[PDB]
Design a protein around this nucleic acid. Sequence first.
RNA 1: UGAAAUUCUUGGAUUUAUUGAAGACUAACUACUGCGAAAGCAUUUGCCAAGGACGUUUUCAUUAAUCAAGAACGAAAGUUAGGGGAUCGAAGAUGAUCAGAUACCGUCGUAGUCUUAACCAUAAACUAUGCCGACUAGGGAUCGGGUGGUGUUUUUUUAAUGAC
Lengths: 211, 79, 179, 127, 17
Amino acid sequence: VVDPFTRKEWFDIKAPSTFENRNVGKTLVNKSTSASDALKGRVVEVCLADLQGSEDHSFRKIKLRVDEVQGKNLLTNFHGMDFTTDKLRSMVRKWQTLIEANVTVKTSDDYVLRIFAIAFTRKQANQVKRHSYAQSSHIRAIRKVISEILTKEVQGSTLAQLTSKLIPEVINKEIENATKDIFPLQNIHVRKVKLLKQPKFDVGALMALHG
Amino acid sequence: VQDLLHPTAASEARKHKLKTLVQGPRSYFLDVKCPGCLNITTVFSHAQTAVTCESCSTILCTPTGGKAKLSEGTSFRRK
Amino acid sequence: IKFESRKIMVPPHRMTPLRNSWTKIYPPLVEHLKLQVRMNLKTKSVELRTNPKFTTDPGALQKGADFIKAFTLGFDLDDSIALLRLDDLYIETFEVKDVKTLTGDHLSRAIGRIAGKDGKTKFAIENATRTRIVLADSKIHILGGFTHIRMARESVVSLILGSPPGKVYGNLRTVASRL
Amino acid sequence: SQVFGVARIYASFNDTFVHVTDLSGKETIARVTGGMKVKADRDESSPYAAMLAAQDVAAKCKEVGITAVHVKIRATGGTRTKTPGPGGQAALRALARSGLRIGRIEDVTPVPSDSTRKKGGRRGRRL
Amino acid sequence: PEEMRKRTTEMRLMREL
RNA sequence: UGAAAUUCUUGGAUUUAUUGAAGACUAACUACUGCGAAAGCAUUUGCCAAGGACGUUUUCAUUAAUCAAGAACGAAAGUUAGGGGAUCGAAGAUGAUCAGAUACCGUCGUAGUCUUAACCAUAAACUAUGCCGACUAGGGAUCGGGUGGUGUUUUUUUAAUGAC
Ligand SMILES: [Mg+2]
Ligand SMILES: [Mg+2]
Ligand SMILES: [Mg+2]
Ligand SMILES: [Mg+2]
Ligand SMILES: [Mg+2]
Ligand SMILES: [Mg+2]
Ligand SMILES: [Zn+2]
């Protein structure tokens, strides 16, 4: 007897300042009888290309969770990162060794998180062999190097600083430089980020992130 | 065609140590001069031990899979 | 007809055939469909776009992307062109392990049984069922009409489960006559 | 001036769903399935069923205010087939023809790192 | 020279073959 | 489902999103390639011991080959007594029993599948091919080690390593 959208109300989602494009669309929710409680905890996943306006990030997605509401504006915070399935299926190819590492670490903000990084072996410029398999010693060494690097950047930074590092892909270049002597590699990427635990909420630390 | 009694020197050089006409070692001994004291020490080419100069107790070679790697700065001659 | 884009990543083993067949791929896309075609060598993905001032058929972009995708899966160009020509062709994809968990020589023989000697068995299914089949290792793709791909799938699946080719061949004649 | 939703297409063997929701995914805008648009249960997985379902949601979404949708096509996944079927392919084509702007198309099939056993048994299934 | 690259490719095809 | 019906469902099914719990299994990389006496072995990290090959101008000096008796391990299924019990699933039940390419299909599912301490000792346990030793053609691919180069690349100070 009631069309539900007569009672719905629209809200505009705003992204953190760390991303270029704050406008990330809008959502809807039932009008308060409150709308805030249903709104809070809502998670939206969006490609980095839209937020940065560059097609160089076509294969990466960011999950942002709603943490505050003010006057129809939903102030969100970084919640996770992932790759698109097509890109991962593209990288994973025959005749090469896959080296994947994961590390659990807490930022300077007590944000406990888990970083998954992936890399693959590549053949040299003059290489003639079909395959570029790496001996298990080299794989273990590279995995250790990646783990140390990721722990170092995460521990000595805040979550906002961590995202600021994630966007330009500096960590991937650092891994490439560190692992250059061990074995040649390609497609070095921070495959995924999970946010396991959260500290006590601080609306000031969110407003500062949103300006 | 080849003569087994009189094999070519290069041919024998290519073969494995035990597979030549009369088996013999492909290793050798070296006179290594310590950078400090300039004394000479005899070192096996395939040394399995970290040979140390007796006077200065300085590492002259380090063991590896095959031939020992001589320490940097140590002059050597084949004895 | 708004400005829209599609991206279709080309796997490495299909890049070289894409090169030799590019001369016959961009004409139909740019002429009939009035699409803006391009390949990004940096990303190795075929890029198609709608030209708002020129493109007129709303379904051209998606029609073109499926045509590129069909070539990407391993279907010959002319068969892929059928997607541009028609509007009632679909691609069915399934793996051997979905039917039956085959490993080692059992998996190799299953693929050999589907293809048959000199590919005869695969052609037999294709002709009888009016479909095209690409047998990529343990990955099988079938292209054709919806009712047709199901018929080909059943003939393929019977081969995976162990049915000999000879019996499946006779069944193809029966359904072919019904068609 | 351009509002985005998300169009989730679930292409199973015996039916096709077309579900349009807001960006978060909590709020449903319109859910139509192949069964609601066909008289015989055999044709629910038919591409024709999907086209009717896609057109109905496309019309409904335009009424609401949604003018563009991101496509997240998926199959049953899990221990079963991982690629969307023709029902899903047909639904995607109809949505494009509807004039509703297609933002981004990605496959989100649930793929297991390694899964439980498959229902077939040792001898297989799907005779 | 870049002709060396041509030599590697020709060998690569022969090995893949 | 070839079409149905047992089944769930306005007390909200199927689908959507945020979580949580349990028990298994380690996709793509994955290759008759690698390891182990065989059966077998695939997520990361640590500990414990073991092993082939290679290098050695090190040591012992016939200590060796094959093996009734006798002993260790022995896929899957299976038995005893605890634990666990997600999935699939012998047995059992039940819907339908119309139509031959889709002709055995569906739903619930006991024992089992998993684990600890013991039994059982069978496979197309296959290279349908005993173990040890010697000899009898060329070719280029791959895995592990070693030697040689005044070879490319990296170390983006050199270099030395690593990779080719
Ligand atoms: Mg290996
Ligand atoms: Mg030994
Ligand atoms: Mg025993
Ligand atoms: Mg028990
Ligand atoms: Mg066996
Ligand atoms: Mg012999
Ligand atoms: Zn000295």
